[PDB]
Amino acid sequence: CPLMVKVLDAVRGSPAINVAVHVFRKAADDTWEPFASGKTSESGELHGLTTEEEFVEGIYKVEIDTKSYWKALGISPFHEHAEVVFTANDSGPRRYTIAALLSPYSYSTTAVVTN
Amino acid sequence: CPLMVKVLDAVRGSPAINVAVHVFRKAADDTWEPFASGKTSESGELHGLTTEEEFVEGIYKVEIDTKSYWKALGISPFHEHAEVVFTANDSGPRRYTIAALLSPYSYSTTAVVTN
Amino acid sequence: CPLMVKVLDAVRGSPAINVAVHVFRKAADDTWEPFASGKTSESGELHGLTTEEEFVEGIYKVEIDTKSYWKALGISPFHEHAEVVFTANDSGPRRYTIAALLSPYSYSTTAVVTN
Amino acid sequence: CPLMVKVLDAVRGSPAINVAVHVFRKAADDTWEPFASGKTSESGELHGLTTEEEFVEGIYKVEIDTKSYWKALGISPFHEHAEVVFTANDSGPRRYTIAALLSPYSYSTTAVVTN
Numbered sequence: 190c191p192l193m194v195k196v197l198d199a200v201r202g203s204p205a206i207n208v209a210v211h212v213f214r215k216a217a218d219d220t221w222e223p224f225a226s227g228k229t230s231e232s233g234e235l236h237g238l239t240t241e242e243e244f245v246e247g248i249y250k251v252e253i254d255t256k257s258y259w260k261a262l263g264i265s266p267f268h269e270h271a272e273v274v275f276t277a278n279d280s281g282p283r284r285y286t287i288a289a290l291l292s293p294y295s296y297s298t299t300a301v302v303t304n
Numbered sequence: 305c306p307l308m309v310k311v312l313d314a315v316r317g318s319p320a321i322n323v324a325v326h327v328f329r330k331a332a333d334d335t336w337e338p339f340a341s342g343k344t345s346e347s348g349e350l351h352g353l354t355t356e357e358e359f360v361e362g363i364y365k366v367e368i369d370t371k372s373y374w375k376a377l378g379i380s381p382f383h384e385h386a387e388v389v390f391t392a393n394d395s396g397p398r399r400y401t402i403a404a405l406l407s408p409y410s411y412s413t414t415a416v417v418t419n
Numbered sequence: 420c421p422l423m424v425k426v427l428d429a430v431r432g433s434p435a436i437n438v439a440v441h442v443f444r445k446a447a448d449d450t451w452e453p454f455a456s457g458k459t460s461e462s463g464e465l466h467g468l469t470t471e472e473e474f475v476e477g478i479y480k481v482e483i484d485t486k487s488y489w490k491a492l493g494i495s496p497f498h499e500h501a502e503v504v505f506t507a508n509d510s511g512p513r514r515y516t517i518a519a520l521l522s523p524y525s526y527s528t529t530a531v532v533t534n
Numbered sequence: 535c536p537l538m539v540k541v542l543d544a545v546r547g548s549p550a551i552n553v554a555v556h557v558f559r560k561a562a563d564d565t566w567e568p569f570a571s572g573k574t575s576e577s578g579e580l581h582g583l584t585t586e587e588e589f590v591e592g593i594y595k596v597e598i599d600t601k602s603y604w605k606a607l608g609i610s611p612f613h614e615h616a617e618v619v620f621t622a623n624d625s626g627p628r629r630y631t632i633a634a635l636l637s638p639y640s641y642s643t644t645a646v647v648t649n
């Protein structure tokens with residue numbers, strides 16, 4: 190897994206389960222082309238989005254559907270989604286972990302980049 | 305001032321100064337029409353982006369140029385920027401404060417919505 | 420006002436109001452001598468905790484009663500409180516702002532230190 | 535592992551390695567008695583602090599030595615440490631994951647509590 194997404198719920202103190210995640214890659218014509226998508230598991234993790242071969246150099250956008258997550262719990266949140274945009278693999282292949290913590294009116298995201 | 309942005313620097317424990325902030329409104333064609341912009345003051349605040357007349361219900365995007373900020377400090381950042389996307393006033397005009405805390409590999413944002 | 424505390428609520432997207440805040444100074448016996456205290460205002464701010472004369476170099480603890488806050492909202496919290504421990508002015512009087520964002524199972528804090 | 539601690543570095547986008555962690559438990563005479571201690575591994579994780587049998591009901595304090603971590607990287611941080619105080623196992627045995635994200639002038643902590 191060159192790209193992994195982990196999402197936590199700050200209100201329930203739990204993994205954020207069944208959270209839709211969409212990954213895009215900036216095309217040559219500056220458009221966002223769909224790259225991969227999935228949903229977080231029971232552990233709040235999303236594995237197997239892509240492969241080392243497919244995950245080339247580029248600018249990527251990870252869009253976490255936080256709104257749908259909070260709605261399903263009967264909460265009307267502030268954000269439409271949580272976005273993470275980053276240039277990947279510019280100095281060679283790396284392993285990326287995108288961690289997100291969710292509150293109805295707040296979110297934080299951090300990146301763990303290893304070799 | 306129905307919309308305010310405040311940005312902090314978690315590395316130097318200071319306001320994030322001279323940070324470019326762009327605000328967009330979602331058009332009917334579902335693209336982002338530029339709406340307002342500016343740069344954070346010495347207190348890391350950005351006021352007078354819009355007015356009560358102009359700030360109608362809709363979906364707004366607040367884009368914070370975090371990458372330029374870190375580049376100017378000589379610090380390698382992860383994110384291209386920080387986006388904050390929300391539906392405004394979906395029950396009528398309140399005051400919006402978008403607060404952001406910046407680190408090279410992490411950002412957190414929260415909304416303070418008041419009467 | 421050399422020391423200010425501001426508390427936000429990530430669940431309701433509002434200032435955290437009427438939150439008890441206690442400040443301690445580390446004594447020579449290395450216990451915490453009470454120093455100042457108060458409750459956050461309607462803007463979630465707490466001013467006039469101390470003065471420039473009283474606020475000398477040393478190790479200070481800012482204890483935020485987050486548990487009482489969540490109990491009053493009818494929300495089950497994880498933390499007993501939020502402590503912020505720091506060495507003050509270790510190169511001479513600057514102004515300190517302790518910002519805290521509260522969620523039932525999470526809290527974040529940052530310091531804004533200025534001239 | 536009924537109690538696990540995971541620590542990340544928001545400046546380097548990496549696990550926080552070799553971070554000292556001290557766990558205390560509130561005694562009957564209201565004193566903090568030493569419970570367990572350890573250091574985070576290469577993955578920024580601390581496992582095997584305690585056992586299901588030893589981890590009884592009580593109020594616990596997890597103290598993360600963030601100051602020493604930043605010093606070793608040539609940084610003079612704001613906080614002396616990052617503290618997490620919580621009542622554990624009040625409605626029966628639970629599994630606790632304490633996650634912490636570190637910046638020189640900021641930290642956030644969240645709890646993941648499962649069965």
Ligand SMILES: CC1(C)C=Cc2c(ccc3c2OC[C@@H](c2ccc(O)cc2O)C3)O1
Nearest residue numbers: 195197288289290297299540633634635642
């Ligand atoms: C930024 C903040 C507030 C603090 C750290 C954090 C987070 C959300 C999710 C995760 C965080 O760190 C631990 C991380 C994690 C958990 C289990 C695991 O096996 C690997 C991991 O990288 C998940 O939010």
Ligand SMILES: CC1(C)C=Cc2c(ccc3c2OC[C@@H](c2ccc(O)cc2O)C3)O1
Nearest residue numbers: 310403404405412425427518519520527529
């Ligand atoms: C750390 C995090 C997640 C993000 C920023 C933040 C916060 C909690 C409280 C405050 C934050 O930044 C803005 C700050 C603030 C607000 C109004 C003001 O007039 C001055 C300020 O310094 C208060 O949580």
Ligand SMILES: [Ca+2]
Nearest residue numbers: 246278279280
């Ligand atoms: Ca390259």
Ligand SMILES: [Ca+2]
Nearest residue numbers: 591623624625
């Ligand atoms: Ca009990």
